[PDB]
Amino acid sequence: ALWQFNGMIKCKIPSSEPLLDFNNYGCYCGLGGSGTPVDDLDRCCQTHDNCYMQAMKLDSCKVLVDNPYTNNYSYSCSNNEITCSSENNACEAFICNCDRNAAICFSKVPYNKEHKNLDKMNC
Numbered sequence: 001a002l003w004q005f006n007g008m009i010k011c012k013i014p015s016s017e018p019l020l021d022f023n024n025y026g027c028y029c030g031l032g033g034s035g036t037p038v039d040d041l042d043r044c045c046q047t048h049d050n051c052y053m054q055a056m057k058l059d060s061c062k063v064l065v066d067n068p069y070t071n072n073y074s075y076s077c078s079n080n081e082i083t084c085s086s087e088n089n090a091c092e093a094f095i096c097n098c099d100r101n102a103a104i105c106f107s108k109v110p111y112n113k114e115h116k117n118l119d120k121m122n123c
């Protein structure tokens, strides 16, 4: 769920408030997304968006009313390392992986404040 994704990013980037720093950034960070990614961070979000799209296609996810943003899963942060729990069932495990990959991606790319709250017209 969104709450866990926020926690994951904080696990890799201790100085950030994810929902404020990464939400509505570029053409893909935030609900929806299209066009050419504006930078590498935006590309991290594009990959995350695709991962969520793939999740919704899974048979295991289609039996659930929850979507990637509302489906709670289990994970832990320890020594700034993210671990998706083996107790996650198929659908939540996939989503956990999507989130973990994006959290790590965010931590390895530059942040360009200029792209915050970017106009969806540039997309």
Ligand SMILES: COc1ccc(C(=O)O)cc1
Pocket: 005, 006, 018, 019, 022, 023, 028, 029, 030, 031, 032, 045, 048, 049
């Ligand atoms: C808290 O950070 C994010 C970043 C990207 C997205 C998204 O692309 O939907 C959602 C939350």
Ligand SMILES: [Ca+2]
Pocket: 028, 029, 030, 031, 032, 033, 045, 049
């Ligand atoms: Ca998005």
Ligand SMILES: [Ca+2]
Pocket: 071, 072, 073, 092
């Ligand atoms: Ca769940």
Ligand SMILES: [Ca+2]
Pocket: 034, 035, 122, 123
């Ligand atoms: Ca366009």
Ligand SMILES: [Cl-]
Pocket: 080, 081, 082, 083, 104
């Ligand atoms: Cl990790």
